[PDB]
Design a protein around this ligand. Structure first.
Ligand code: CA
Length: 279
């Protein structure tokens, strides 16, 4: 399948080179997988989700995304137009309030909640979680990420937005999950991407067009926008039979475009998420 004049990040993760705008992909498009977006929620009523998105948990007084962040992430995972895995089932877990912020203990609560709930959902092809959030190192936050991963969920986490080595940030530093940095449409590391040997992979994160609340769209930027490109991609790869929730971060690294980002500080991977469809 091909989708012309695509947001640029969807073309990138289907390209070897930058500078094009079609998204080439297999039509199975993540059918039969599932992705949890653990964030401010998901405006599931956005027609771009076409009935495939459900809130299923909140730790606040409403499950609605009243911020838009969670809705934008989720759109990149699996909206019809702006998504990677255009036919995956989405699930929302509102651990962030509406300004964006969340205490660690609630973020922990929502992470253990996915390891349990996946057992209440129909995900024959695999299950993913997408965490576009974080804050300073915590053993506990990190441990809640290893559990979620260990429970057979592919966990994708934002490396962080300070340009700082991410080993000081959680859940990014947690080694057993898949820590994602951001790039730009000219293959530069985005100016705000954390970096450091705990990263596994980069995806698109600078000027990422996706859904927003009010039925709407916007382009915003972050390792947060990069993260749901890897999550959606892993859903897409499960479904295709290429990899498994426990093997997907290694498979994506193995199949990445290798060398191609400029400003990888020394010691940081220079691997860019690629779908290995058109070549
Ligand atoms: Ca890893």
């Amino acid at each position: 399948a091909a989708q012309t004049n695509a947001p640029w990040g969807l073309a990138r993760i289907s390209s070897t080179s930058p500078g094009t705008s079609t998204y080439y992909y297999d039509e199975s498009a993540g059918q039969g997988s599932c992705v949890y977006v653990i964030d401010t929620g998901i405006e599931a009523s956005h027609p771009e989700f076409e009935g495939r998105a459900q809130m299923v948990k909140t730790y606040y007084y409403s499950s609605r995304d009243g911020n838009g962040h969670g809705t934008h992430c989720a759109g990149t995972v699996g909206s019809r137009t702006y998504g990677v895995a255009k036919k995956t089932q989405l699930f929302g877990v509102k651990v962030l309030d509406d300004n964006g912020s969340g205490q660690y203990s609630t973020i922990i609560a929502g992470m253990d909640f996915v390891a349990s709930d996946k057992n209440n959902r129909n995900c024959p092809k695999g299950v993913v979680a997408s965490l576009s959030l974080g804050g300073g190192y915590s053993s506990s936050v990190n441990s809640a990420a290893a559990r979620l991963q260990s429970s057979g969920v592919m966990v994708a986490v934002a490396a962080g937005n300070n340009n700082a080595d991410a080993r000081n940030y959680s859940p990014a530093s947690e080694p057993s999950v898949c820590t994602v940095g951001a790039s730009d449409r000219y293959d530069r590391r985005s100016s705000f991407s954390n970096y450091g040997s705990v990263l596994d992979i980069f995806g698109p994160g600078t000027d990422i067009l996706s859904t927003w609340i009010g039925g709407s769209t916007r382009s915003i930027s972050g390792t947060s926008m990069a993260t749901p490109h890897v999550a959606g991609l892993a859903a897409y790869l499960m479904t295709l039979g290429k990899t498994t929730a426990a093997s997907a971060c290694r498979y994506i690294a193995d199949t990445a475009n290798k060398g191609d980002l400029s400003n990888i500080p020394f010691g940081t991977v220079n691997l860019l998420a690629y779908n290995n469809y058109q070549a």
